[PDB]
A and B are shown apart, each in its own frame.
With several copies, the nearest count.
Chain A
Amino acid sequence: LSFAPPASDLSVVFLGNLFGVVDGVLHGTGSQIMGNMFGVFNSAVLALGGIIIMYTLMVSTMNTAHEGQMLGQKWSSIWIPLRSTFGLALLIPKASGYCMMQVFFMWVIVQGVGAADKIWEAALSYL
C-alpha cells in the first residue's frame, strides 16, 4: 500500500535541515537558504519559460499558417487550456519559495525513504 517513514529516522530530518521546510511533507526547520533560492530560481525559470512558450506559440501558429486549416491540426485545442493552467499552477512558488511540483518530488523522495526503511527493517528483524 503506502507507508510514511518512522518519525525517528534521521533521513527525513536531514532532508529537513537541508531543504528547510516543505509544505505538507515535512515539518522540521533548518537552514532556510533553500526556500528562497529555489523560489527565485523558479521565478527566473518562469520568466524564461514564458519567453520560450511565446516562442513556441509563434512557431506553432506559423506551422499552422502553412496548413491553412482552422482550429489547428498539430495540437488538440481542448487539452491546451487545461494543460496550460495545470503547468502554470505547478510553477507557482509559495511563501516558502517552493512550487507544488517540487512538492510531489519531495513526496517521492520520502516514499523511497520509506521503501528503504521497509527493506532495512525487515532485514534487521530477521537478524
Chain B
Amino acid sequence: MASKKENLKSLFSNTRTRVIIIFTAALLIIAVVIGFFKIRGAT
C-alpha cells in the first residue's frame, strides 16, 4: 500500500471532502476563539 502522504493528499484533493473539512476546521477555530475571548474577558 502507498504511504500515508498519498492518501492524505488524495483526501484533500476531493472537492466535497475538502469543503467539509475546511468548514469543520472553521467551526473548530471559531470555538477555540470563543474560548480564548471569554476566558480573557472573564478574568
* A–B contact, 8 Å CB criterion (strictly below): yes
Give the Cβ gap from A51 to chain B, nearest Cβ, in Å: 8
How many A-B contacts at CB < 8 Å in the complex? 80
Chain B interface size, as a band, is 20 to 34
Give the Cβ gap from A82 to chain B, nearest Cβ, in Å: 11
Residues of chain A within 8 A (CB-CB) of B7 are: 64-65, 67-68
- The answer on a CB contact under 8 Å between A71 and B34 is no
- The answer on a CB contact under 8 Å between A1 and B8 is no
For residue A40, CB closer than 8 A to chain B, the reply is: yes
* Chain A contact surface mostly: helix
Q: Interface residues, chain B, CB within 8 Å of chain A?
A: 1-2, 4, 7-8, 10-11, 14, 16-17, 20-21, 23-24, 27-28, 30-32, 34-36, 38-39, 42-43
Q: Interface residues, chain A, CB within 8 Å of chain B?
A: 1, 36, 39-40, 43-44, 46-47, 49-51, 53-54, 57, 61-62, 64-65, 67-68, 70-72, 77, 80-81, 84-85, 88, 91-93, 118, 121-122, 125
